[PDB]
């Protein structure tokens, strides 16, 4: 499974959903997650993220390990997203800010 990590929060570009063959992204107010069961590990999404927030599960940085289980839990509750949409308004002010997990909205 590929995992979306911290830098997606408050950026939410949605470029990643274009390339997914299996539509495994689920949408929250200010973040996206990948559903782990459904992901086929094709890796096509991680070159597409402008925030460079997507990682193969086995490459998630040590300080972002929480995101692996988070993608798994939130994917069970959030709606499926299959079309790109516009980035959140202030997306590049927040792109690159560390520690955005305190800002995640359910
Ligand atoms: S690795 Fe492929 S199947 Fe998994 S979320 Fe990314 S684009 Fe979809
Ligand atoms: S910022 Fe997030 S919405 Fe997709 S394109 Fe990157 S993982």
């Amino acid at each position: 499974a590929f995992v979306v990590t911290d830098n997606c929060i408050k950026c939410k570009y949605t470029d990643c959903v274009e390339v997914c063959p299996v539509d495994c992204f689920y949408e929250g107010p200010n973040f996206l997650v990948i559903h782990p069961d459904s992901c086929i590990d094709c890796a096509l999404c991680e070159p597409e993220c402008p925030a460079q927030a997507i990682f193969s599960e086995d490459e998630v940085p040590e300080d972002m390990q929480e995101f692996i289980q988070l993608n798994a839990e939130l994917a069970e509750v959030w709606p499926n997203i299959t079309e790109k949409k516009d980035p959140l308004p202030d997306a590049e002010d927040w792109d690159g800010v560390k520690g955005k997990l305190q800002h995640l909205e359910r």
Side-chain angles (χ1 to χ4, degrees):
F2 272 64
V3 180
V4 179
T5 64
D6 195 83
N7 198 31
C8 178
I9 302 173
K10 295 214 135 186
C11 292
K12 194 187 170 177
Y13 291 104
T14 73
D15 292 309
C16 55
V17 307
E18 248 102 296
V19 77
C20 192
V22 285
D23 293 314
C24 45
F25 283 87
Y26 287 78
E27 196 193 345
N30 70 1
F31 178 60
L32 254 67
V33 292
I34 286 170
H35 192 312
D37 301 328
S38 163
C39 178
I40 58 172
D41 289 288
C42 78
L44 259 29
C45 47
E46 63 131 294
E48 295 302 301
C49 183
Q52 282 306 287
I54 297 186
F55 294 82
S56 185
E57 187 180 4
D58 47 77
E59 296 181 32
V60 169
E62 191 284 311
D63 60 340
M64 287 203 271
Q65 290 288 306
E66 332 73 94
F67 282 97
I68 302 174
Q69 189 185 306
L70 238 207
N71 279 240
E73 298 281 339
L74 291 176
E76 294 299 305
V77 294
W78 281 349
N80 197 195
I81 176 185
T82 53
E83 298 202 63
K84 202 200 131 67
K85 73 224 290 181
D86 276 287
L88 290 183
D90 278 32
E92 34 62 85
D93 282 348
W94 287 101
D95 183 327
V97 171
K98 88 147 193 272
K100 287 187 291 175
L101 182 60
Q102 48 174 305
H103 298 102
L104 183 115
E105 286 172 65
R106 202 193 144 127

